[PDB]
Every structure is written in C-alpha cells, then in structure tokens.
Design a binder for this molecule. Structure first.
Ligand code: NA
Ligand SMILES: [Pt+2]
Length: 129
C-alpha cells in the first residue's frame, strides 16, 4: 500500500506516534517519506546480509525474522513480512520498541540525514488531524 501523506499522518497519530518518546508526528511522516516513499511493501538489502522492511525500513539484523539473516535477533517477535502489510500496526508497534532503545530516531539513517533539525511540521501541514 502506498499511503498518501495525510493518510499516513492520520494512521500514525491514531497508533500513538505523535510525541512518542518526544518525537512530533512530522518526524515520523518525514522518516517514512525518505525510508520508503510511504510504501508498506518497500524492501532493501543491507551490506551485512540483513534486509530492511516496510514503511519505516525495520532491519532483520535486530527486529524481525526473515529466515535469511542467520545469527540475528527478532526483538519485535514477528516475521519481517508482517512489516509489509497495508495495516501499519506491526510496523508502528515495532518502531515504538526501536525508538525506545536508547538511540531515539537516529536508528533511522534517512531521519538522521534528511529530517533531523529540519521544519518537520511541514510534513503534516494541510492535514485534518
Ligand atoms: Na532477525
Ligand atoms: Pt495502534
């Protein structure tokens, strides 16, 4: 599913990401734009053999089981395919564990490099939230 910007903002808000660990909703919408282009089906292979999955590009190295990342962890206790659903619940629930783990949104390379320190409130402008 490719979300619209305000459509994703509404879903992320409903699932409790606005101000989650102090990150405003615009931070999460910006992170999903640059991680996945708002596409729940996005997948990208990492150099270490792991893969990033879904609208927030969650890594099989630590967070999910994809059956091809040997020696890895599954800290969200899910198959990585759960992170590709049109329903973002599994991605949002897993993102909450990631952002809680001590590095905050720096875990998302695209957030660090393209969102951090920018006018992230622009990402929710015009939306009826
Ligand atoms: Na894993
Ligand atoms: Pt939820």
């Amino acid at each position: 599913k490719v979300f619209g910007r305000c459509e994703l903002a509404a879903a992320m808000k409903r699932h409790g990401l606005d101000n989650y660990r102090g990150y405003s909703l615009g931070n999460w919408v910006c992170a999903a734009k640059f991680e996945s282009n708002f596409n729940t089906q996005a997948t990208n292979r990492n150099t270490d053999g792991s893969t990033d999955y879904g609208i927030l590009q969650i890594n099989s190295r630590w967070w999910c089981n994809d059956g091809r990342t040997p020696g890895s962890r599954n800290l969200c206790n899910i198959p990585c395919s759960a992170l590709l659903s049109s329903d973002i619940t599994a991605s949002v629930n897993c993102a909450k564990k990631i952002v809680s783990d001590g590095n905050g949104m720096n875990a998302w390379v695209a957030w660090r490099n393209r969102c951090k320190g920018t006018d992230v409130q622009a990402w929710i402008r015009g939306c009826r939230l």
